[PDB]
Design a protein around this ligand. Sequence first.
Ligand SMILES: [K+]
Ligand SMILES: [K+]
Ligand SMILES: [K+]
Ligand SMILES: [K+]
Ligand SMILES: [K+]
Ligand SMILES: [K+]
Ligand SMILES: [Mg+2]
Ligand SMILES: [Mg+2]
Ligand SMILES: [Mg+2]
Ligand SMILES: [Mg+2]
Ligand SMILES: [Mg+2]
Ligand SMILES: [Mg+2]
Ligand SMILES: [Mg+2]
Ligand SMILES: [Mg+2]
Ligand SMILES: [Mg+2]
Ligand SMILES: [Mg+2]
Ligand SMILES: [Mg+2]
Ligand SMILES: [Mg+2]
Ligand SMILES: [Mg+2]
Ligand SMILES: [Mg+2]
Ligand SMILES: [Mg+2]
Ligand SMILES: [Mg+2]
Ligand SMILES: [Mg+2]
Ligand SMILES: [Mg+2]
Ligand SMILES: [Mg+2]
Ligand SMILES: [Mg+2]
Ligand SMILES: [Mg+2]
Ligand SMILES: [Mg+2]
Ligand SMILES: [Mg+2]
Lengths: 129, 247, 205, 343, 132, 210
Amino acid sequence: RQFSYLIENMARDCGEYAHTRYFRGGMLTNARLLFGPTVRLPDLIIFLHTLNNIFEPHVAVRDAAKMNIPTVGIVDTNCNPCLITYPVPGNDDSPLAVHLYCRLFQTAITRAKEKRQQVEALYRLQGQK
Amino acid sequence: PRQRAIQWGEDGRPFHYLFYTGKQSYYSLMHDVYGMLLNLEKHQVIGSRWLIKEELEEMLVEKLSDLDYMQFIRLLEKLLTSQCGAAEEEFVQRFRRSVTLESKKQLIEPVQYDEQGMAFSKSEGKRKTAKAEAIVYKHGSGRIKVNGIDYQLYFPITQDREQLMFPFHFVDRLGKHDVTCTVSGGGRSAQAGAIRLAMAKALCSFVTEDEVEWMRQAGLLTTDPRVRERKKPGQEGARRKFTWKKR
Amino acid sequence: SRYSPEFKDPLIDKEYYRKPVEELTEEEKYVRELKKTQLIKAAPAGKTSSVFEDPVISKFTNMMMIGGNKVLARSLMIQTLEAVKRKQFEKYHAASAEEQATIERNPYTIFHQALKNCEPMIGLVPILKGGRFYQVPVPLPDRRRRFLAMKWMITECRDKKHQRTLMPEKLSHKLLEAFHNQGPVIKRKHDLHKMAEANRALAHY
Amino acid sequence: SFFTKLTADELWKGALAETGAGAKKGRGKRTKKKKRKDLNRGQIIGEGRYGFLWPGLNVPLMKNGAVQTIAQRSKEEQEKVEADMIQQREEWDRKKKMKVKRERGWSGNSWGGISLGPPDPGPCGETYEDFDTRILEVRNVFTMTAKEGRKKSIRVLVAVGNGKGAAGFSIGKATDRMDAFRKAKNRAVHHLHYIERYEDHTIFHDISLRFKRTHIKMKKQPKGYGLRCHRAIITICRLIGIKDMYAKVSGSINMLSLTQGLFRGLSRQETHQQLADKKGLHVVEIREECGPLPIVVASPRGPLRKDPEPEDEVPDVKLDWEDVKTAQGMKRSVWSNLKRAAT
Amino acid sequence: KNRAARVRVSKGDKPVTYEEAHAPHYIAHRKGWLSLHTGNLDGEDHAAERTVEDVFLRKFMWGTFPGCLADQLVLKRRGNQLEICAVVLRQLSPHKYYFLVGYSETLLSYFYKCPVRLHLQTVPSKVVYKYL
Amino acid sequence: KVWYESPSLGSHSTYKPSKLEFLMRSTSKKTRKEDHARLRALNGLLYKALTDLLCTPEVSQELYDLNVELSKVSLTPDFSACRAYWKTTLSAEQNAHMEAVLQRSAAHMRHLLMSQQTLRNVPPIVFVQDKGNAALAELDQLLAVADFGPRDTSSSLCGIDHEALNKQIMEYKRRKDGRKRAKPRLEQDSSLKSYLSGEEVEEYECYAPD
RNA sequence: GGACCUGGCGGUGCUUCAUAUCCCUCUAGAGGAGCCUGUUCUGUAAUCGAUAAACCCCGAUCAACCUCACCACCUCUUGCUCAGCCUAUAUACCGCCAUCUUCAGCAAACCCUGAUGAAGGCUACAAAGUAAGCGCAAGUACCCACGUAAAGACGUUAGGUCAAGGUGUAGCCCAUGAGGUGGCAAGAAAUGGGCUACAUUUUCUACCCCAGAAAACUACGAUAGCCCUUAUGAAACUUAAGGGUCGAAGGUGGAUUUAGC
Ligand SMILES: [K+]
Ligand SMILES: [K+]
Ligand SMILES: [K+]
Ligand SMILES: [K+]
Ligand SMILES: [K+]
Ligand SMILES: [K+]
Ligand SMILES: [Mg+2]
Ligand SMILES: [Mg+2]
Ligand SMILES: [Mg+2]
Ligand SMILES: [Mg+2]
Ligand SMILES: [Mg+2]
Ligand SMILES: [Mg+2]
Ligand SMILES: [Mg+2]
Ligand SMILES: [Mg+2]
Ligand SMILES: [Mg+2]
Ligand SMILES: [Mg+2]
Ligand SMILES: [Mg+2]
Ligand SMILES: [Mg+2]
Ligand SMILES: [Mg+2]
Ligand SMILES: [Mg+2]
Ligand SMILES: [Mg+2]
Ligand SMILES: [Mg+2]
Ligand SMILES: [Mg+2]
Ligand SMILES: [Mg+2]
Ligand SMILES: [Mg+2]
Ligand SMILES: [Mg+2]
Ligand SMILES: [Mg+2]
Ligand SMILES: [Mg+2]
Ligand SMILES: [Mg+2]
């Protein structure tokens, strides 16, 4: 919760999604009931902290694997990375570490979205002529 | 029912960045309030109530828990205690409802004048099935007429006369007003109660505002709601049950 | 009740309202500004602001009332107060200048003191132990002592031992007896106390 | 009296007696049961005993361009209408009596082995027509409850598979057996294993594992050997697509342990390509029917080792006395190698 | 437990109409009356006769339009006019509905000695208020 | 662990015993198996803290001389109050001295109890003179003041209602003058036979059609 | 037989409880008398049903004939009915209900944990539960937002009712059906509920609350008994009302027990 506000802002700014609140049973494994039969689930889940507030793995780590969603995760030395698709060993506590991670992912995501627009636009201009 | 339109477009991407919380509107509000508390630090009752949980559940158009409502209120209170500016004051008032604080102050009847020019007020009172209408004159000698009869001839029971005395005595105006009242229905005590209430309301036109509030706090301006309870079928009375037969 | 819990009981006391503002404390100032926002119950027909209002006699009258007949109950009360006063005016005129100073002629003072002489300080409770019943002494609250004094007086006057004597003569005679620490009702107080002394060893139950 | 008559629904609800203390606890049993019949089924509006022909209700309104008039079927032709309705009634009864039976399972009264069909199509236009469902166990579970005493629920174990390596199983629990079937089969399709098959007919190597107290020993077999396995394993092997295998189940014969024990062993089998990649050597298959011809079944994708695999004169592998006792002709059993139906 | 006119809860599969879903205590609160006449007003006569006529008309129409009625009848009386308003299905051919309307209006007018009119509203299927 | 169980999953949770947490708690929530343990052991800690303050002269000279002994100390689960009990002395005169000093010391003692930062948040402490049997004490106070005035069946024996039994006889005199139960698991069903029997119960629209 | 789960139970622990309630406390009663009325028992040629809580002025907002289903006698036979049956079975049912309920839970569709065992699924500074249905709630009726009604699921007692009506199954069809005439419906008693009393806060009269008399064997007290009128009816020792006569038990009721915020 020290970084809930920071993470929600980073997600909004890059045009993605954040879930920093209490994780209700079945958000991923029972999503169609909770959201609707046509709900689209995330294609990638990034954990800036893989542990919950009782020092156990965040339930979404297991549930992301159950739903075959790849996970990126900052994994500190007390964390379990077995089920994290792309783990990144790193400090998850210090504000300087967490701020850095948010800048890097925010920038990586923002650059890739701008690159997609550049390529698409070029592919269209060349297509007409 | 204003269930929000599909919360994603054709590509399936949700519109709101907090969609996957399932409570995007509630958490978007908590996020905005938490952010304001941060900015203040970087920079540094009777009139209204808080909105009820069902009124928050309509502003947000979502279902809320009881603890969800509390956390939001605890966060707004934490925002008032700070040096909130004008921008942080329009926001809090969106969640402060105008409590129906219509004053308990008694309404004063108008002072009328008769053919002879004598000032008087008129009011009404109800006790059980008795209904009274009283005319209290601004000046008088303490005469009370009930259906054209002297009050002590109409009310031979001493307790009924004490009830007529109660309003005038409480404001120290015995022997200062003339009253002509008409009462119908109910028994002797209920009629004394109805006249008591009618005279007290009319007498409020000739006393100070503080005296009218003292009469209110003495129970002289409240209609007694205690009326006979209906008998129910299968029991002897309104509350009494038939004897539970010996087993 | 037809009153919502929001309704507060009315305070019928002329003095309470004429009291100046300066004399008021910061706590008493808050209570007065609060009641201006509260709902107040209608004053009951029983109590008024009259200077002759006596809550103790009004309560004794209700404990004598049979089947809602307040007119009859109150008639008996005022007839008792008149009978007490006439008995004392007769004792006063028949006395010497020295004894006259000690003779009370106010029936309200006699009525109040007569009841205070009958109030039992301590009472007993029927307690069960091993299929056997043993009474246990216990202090009595102030409400209970005052209620028992009025219940014993009314009960004694309703006793069938009195043959064809009207209630105002019976009650007036018992009140003047109790006023002098004499009578059956005073004995009932003494007996209850004496029993509560013989069961002191049972106070641990 | 006309006013004392009731509707058919009221009359059947009373006569059938389906709600009541008899039907609450099954206190009444029904070898002879009143069966509801729709008595308005074959009835035509306008047709009565008198045989009147009402134009526009039971006969055509216009005949030869002219409006028909009220007419009455004669006694002879009316008699044939009544007879035809009786035959149509007994004919309707006969057709209903005829019903197509279903093939039994492992035994006549057993649910095990019975097909339940494909799982239901998912909400998002998802379909599983390629999958077959088989029942493995149907149990009656009895729960003691604080206020209601012994209650009866159903636990079902079902397996699903498409016959091409994709198979799964799930438990279902419901008060009604059909609901337990729907829950299990629909859930199983979301817990699918992929099972590797050698030449799409057998396992890649002998598998010997224990799950809890249930032992399963499986042997790779050549084509034509068939499924000589516990009947439940046969059912699962048909769903996976295994045609030739021997299996022996020992210890506890618990259907659930056997099912999940079987899937655990079949999902952890190393293929020949994995063996070649792990050891960087060729996997060469020698078949006695093909003589000394070496058949390379798998080659490493990465570099190929130059050092031969060490030849330990004697391997320290643990052997099954049952396998050895059989190879030495010392295994005598009247029940082994018995003639059985094709599986 | 009270039983009168209460469609009891099932497993969520029994379609009920608005009328069937409301117990008697909701009469005059959430649902109106199925017959309107003056016989039950204070100081009015012939409530007994109006009631028998209503019971007959409901049975007559049930058996005259078998399988066609999609809801209870609404009976209206104005002066000596009797109006029967019925919600029916769209299974019977229109010719049969016109035959039965002409037949029923005529027969009921001669039976009760009053001008009787039948007003039919067709629905594709029984209107479902909720699934109990 | 020991025979005393320590399996709780949320063992790393930071215990928060404060008055504010009680208000922000699910009403449905009930105390867990090992939730009482922390309360039983935290209440004991308060007993330890209070006992040391009484016997150390540094805290207060008046308190030390009293030599007060704490009989019991049990905090409340509400987190609003704390119950502490000290043993009374024989001399009622001495009892008054102890309570007076303890009553005034309590306000300061609370701040001294905050010196234990681990136990900093201490609900206001209540001190209860151990008048365990005040019923006799209060009764005997009134019993001396009180004015006493001038000072001078067989039904249970037998165990039966012999009377009621002989009343019913008198009225009479006047008037005249196992199976097998099947094991539930073996109960037979026909659902499969009905399933195997078969259980078979076997467009365009136009305006002005013809 | 071992281990474990659930339930039940414990002369099992601790804790908090019932709000007209488990006990005490408050008020008026019942239990004693007469009478009214139900039931039981007995009686009779002479119904039936309810019958611990949850029967007992209950089906009946009602039996002189009728009602009536009972008994005796007599009579009819395709029968008021495209017959009839108040015949058996409420342990075949619908219908309408009692009961806990002066309760808050019930049943589905999913999801997850336990190795995919019987099982389990909550922590708000939150740790797997959730989108809907029924009940509660809300809303509505009555004089309010209070109160009182109404409402009150699933399940429990094979609870009540085949005699409201309908009806499954079994039985009767010159009789177990139909009709007529007359008749029973009592009290040796026991018991439930109620009424009226035992009186002086009473009794009678005037009045509807400022009165006068009465007040113990000519008082209080029968709505009972007996006698005579009147009303209703074809029919009244019988039902009701009134009058006359009569003036009894009863002198405020043990254990126990009912109701009321
Ligand atoms: K147990
Ligand atoms: K009594
Ligand atoms: K029933
Ligand atoms: K019936
Ligand atoms: K029957
Ligand atoms: K009685
Ligand atoms: Mg860390
Ligand atoms: Mg009453
Ligand atoms: Mg067979
Ligand atoms: Mg009821
Ligand atoms: Mg009696
Ligand atoms: Mg009987
Ligand atoms: Mg019986
Ligand atoms: Mg019976
Ligand atoms: Mg019973
Ligand atoms: Mg007869
Ligand atoms: Mg008769
Ligand atoms: Mg018969
Ligand atoms: Mg039954
Ligand atoms: Mg309203
Ligand atoms: Mg209400
Ligand atoms: Mg009710
Ligand atoms: Mg409700
Ligand atoms: Mg039964
Ligand atoms: Mg019948
Ligand atoms: Mg017969
Ligand atoms: Mg007399
Ligand atoms: Mg008489
Ligand atoms: Mg006559």
